Amino acid sequence: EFNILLATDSYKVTHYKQYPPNTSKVYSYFECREKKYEETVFYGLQYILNKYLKGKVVTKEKIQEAKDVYKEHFQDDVFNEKGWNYILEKYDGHLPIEIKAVPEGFVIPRGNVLFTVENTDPECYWLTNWIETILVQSWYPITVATNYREQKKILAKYLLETSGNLDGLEYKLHDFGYRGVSSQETAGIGASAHLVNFKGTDTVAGLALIKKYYGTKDPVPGYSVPAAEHSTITAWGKDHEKDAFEHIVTQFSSVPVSVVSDSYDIYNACEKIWGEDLRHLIVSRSTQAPLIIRPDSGNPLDTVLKVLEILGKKFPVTENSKGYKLLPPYLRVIQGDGVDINTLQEIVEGMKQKMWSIENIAFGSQKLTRDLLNCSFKCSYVVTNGLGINVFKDPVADPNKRSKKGRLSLHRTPAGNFVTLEEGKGDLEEYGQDLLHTVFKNGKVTKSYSFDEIRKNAQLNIEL
Amino acid sequence: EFNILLATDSYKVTHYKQYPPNTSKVYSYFECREKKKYEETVFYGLQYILNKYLKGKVVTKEKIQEAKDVYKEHFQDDVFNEKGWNYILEKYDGHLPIEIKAVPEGFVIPRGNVLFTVENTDPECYWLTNWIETILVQSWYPITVATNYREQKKILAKYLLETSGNLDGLEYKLHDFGYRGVSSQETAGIGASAHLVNFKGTDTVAGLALIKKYYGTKDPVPGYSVPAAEHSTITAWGKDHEKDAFEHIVTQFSSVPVSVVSDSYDIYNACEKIWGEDLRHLIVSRSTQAPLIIRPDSGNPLDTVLKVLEILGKKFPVTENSKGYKLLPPYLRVIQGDGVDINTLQEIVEGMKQKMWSIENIAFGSLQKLTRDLLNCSFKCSYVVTNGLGINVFKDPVADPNKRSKKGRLSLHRTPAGNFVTLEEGKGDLEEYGQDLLHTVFKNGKVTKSYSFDEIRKNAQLNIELE
């Protein structure tokens, strides 16, 4: 079973011995430090609070386990048994910590306080930074939610330009990343962050995480459609690709179906198999049940443009009100190979240049890290001998790693923007009310958001 | 509770209707595909997945009903193969009718070789082989982490041996600091265990618990750490009191090694004036078994290491070892844990060598952008039986010959020169190439062969270490 006492960086076990003696308060904060990606979607802390931090997280058994493990790990006794026993005895294993945070789904410029953490009992001054490691992992859903919002902005721009509207934007970037992430847990978290922005997903795990920790009015937050993979085409044999295609589109004749078409020759498949041999089975399909042709190899832009040029000559194309070419409603394309934010941008611009509407295409979804948005957790205020002091790092060779000082608060500016106030200056009351809310206190979650509210908070300006 | 019926790519739910009718067998394989350098990979991690996710009664009535309910809403249609899963529940008590054969864990195998194969053991479950692709393919991660760290160890070994004349301490030269930097708790355990295949120093205890539960070591633990400061334990003392913080910390940990981050305000002042003057007397009195380890954590990683060494070299007694390289006294060492990937690791050790500093002096602290594409980890169907006829199948996209897959039943063999070769089209059966190196590790819900973490470490050793 999960043990919070074994869920921290090893050296943090030794930190209670390193703070100034008579320290009663340690106060720390998380930011996406300021140096593309000028604003971040704050998302994912609520999962962490609920799965790992709330309730009786300390037991006699868990304390003994940590004692035994650290004894071998450090080859010495350095584990703070007494401190954890205090929390067990005094608070029935609930963490005497208060966490304040911006609402989930909030879109906030870099360099602002997003959450703060402090101990609520003088005896547990060491606890604030013990849980740094776990809370810092929020960088992942934040960065994923953020990156996908940025992709949506690009898609929205180009769909609006080529079509005159945003219809179907939420299905334009489908999550196919399940097998490409590092773990099952990561699959659920990352997919949920994707679903903040889009509705189309092949990663089931996202749906369950959302239902358990956030909640939606609807039965599910995300949807998929039948689709082929290379094995369901190749199993038929190299000479029977046409047979595979006919069987699949016939099995899925009244729902949308995606069919990977590059097993052997994408261009032949589009022009001769779909565009000739099986054409009668495609033109007869309903607008609610299109064939979605999926190329999956080659240069992403060149392949997409050639696939469209091929289909344009085999199927009736219209020109929409904005002047852009549009395939018939029973025929679409999905490109899910090598689509990152850069390649996404190159494809939609390339399509636009060739007078193809973004209506025609969807994308399928990569190496995001903690340094991308500079997600960082730092101590900014401590009380020692009853005196509060503002603390910070400011390394000489890197001004960008300078941290914020003292008690922090988040405020609306007179122009309606965000500003973080340092050194407890929030208390001067010149900038109105703190925009952070208490989300966790003494083992309990004190404020939470539905996934529906999170989606509303994360909307694009163009959608509003 | 984890439901295997919900642990696949959505579209795979629909594949039982797409395979050719009268298909009784689907046979699929995993490789780190060769690309037209990471020329060899450490196979590691499948055993975790087999035990955590695949073995035993993984199908229940409630799990089938849960999946049916979820899929009805997810697809806005009834596409779920309830009958097929019911069959596994009734006929096999919910155990998966699958056989998996794999190269031993820890094995170091050149790119483009079969590493494991998967096939159904019951004709009715032809669809099941690729249902579990998604979960099996996630093995890319421990494979790639274990491989990347082995490659970093190769570089460390080269330079340590050149500048010192031995490999002493090699297993503690790259410490795992990546806990906060990975995507999840589960990833933390898996990634740290793959690090531990190569090294012994770690701050991610998650990896220790995974190894103990899934692999096992003779020793109490596979990995170790020492006390260390963070910016908070230094800055909490106040801007004017860094010296006080340093003195306090080295005195609290006077008899064990201790790492102390020293760049809170000014790394070069801290090294020259605080450690190298004000507190010098507390450092030069330390035991060889209890060095101070100075930790810079900002600035250009090579520039900073070199300047730190130059500073310390002038404040402390340096010797020249038998190879002609400079060596700090034994009570003083440095760890660089900012921005160290494989490229920067090479640049630092090479830069140190050029400035006549031994690698004995330094240790490093560490994925970053490790992905499935790095080693081209891929799972592909290569053989089916339809209407009782075996057919060899594959993909071969016109615009990318690098994505061509292998054909037929596969086997892995030793070449006459002692290398590896994958045999396709069932040609292993000709028995011209000795025994198949793949072993059955999973069959019908049971793990059939397991490896200790001790064996895996043995298998993954460097040639330089064997010599």
Numbering used by the authors:
A (entry chain B): 8 to 42, 53 to 382, 388 to 486
B (entry chain A): 8 to 43, 53 to 382, 387 to 487
Sentences reproduced from the published study:
NAMPT functions as a homo-dimeric enzyme that catalyzes the rate limiting step in the primary salvage pathway for NAD synthesis, the transfer of a phosphoribosyl residue from 5-phosphoribosyl-1-pyrophosphate (PRPP) to nicotinamide (NAM) to produce nicotinamide mononucleotide (NMN). Crystal structures of NAMPT in numerous ligand-bound forms have been reported. These structures consistently display a NAMPT homo-dimer with two essentially identical active sites at the dimer interface. Typical NAMPT inhibitors were found to occupy the portion of active site responsible for NAM binding and a tunnel-shaped cavity extending from the NAM binding site. Furthermore, we determine the crystal structures of six NAMPT mutants in the apo form and in complex with various inhibitors and present a definitive model to explain the differential effects of the mutations on various structural classes of NAMPT inhibitors.
The crystal structures of NAMPT S165F/Y revealed a somewhat surprising conformational change in a small helical structural motif spans the sequence G383GGLLQ388. We designate this motif as “380GRS” to reflect its position in the primary sequence, and its glycine rich characteristic. The unwinding of the 380GRS in S165 mutants rendered the structure less compatible with the binding of PRPP. Our structural studies thus reveal that the S165 mutation modulates NAMPT activity by interfering with PRPP binding in an allosteric manner. Consistent with the structural observations, S165F/Y mutant NAMPT proteins required approximately 500 fold more PRPP compared to the wild-type protein and the other NAMPT mutants. In all cases the S165Y mutant resulted in greater resistance to NAMPT inhibitors. In contrast, NCI-H460 S165Y tumor xenografts were completely resistant to treatment with GNE-618, even when dosed daily (QD) at higher drug concentrations. Furthermore, xenografts derived from cells harboring the S165Y mutation in NAMPT are resistant to GNE-618 at doses that are efficacious in the parental line, suggesting that this is relevant in vivo.
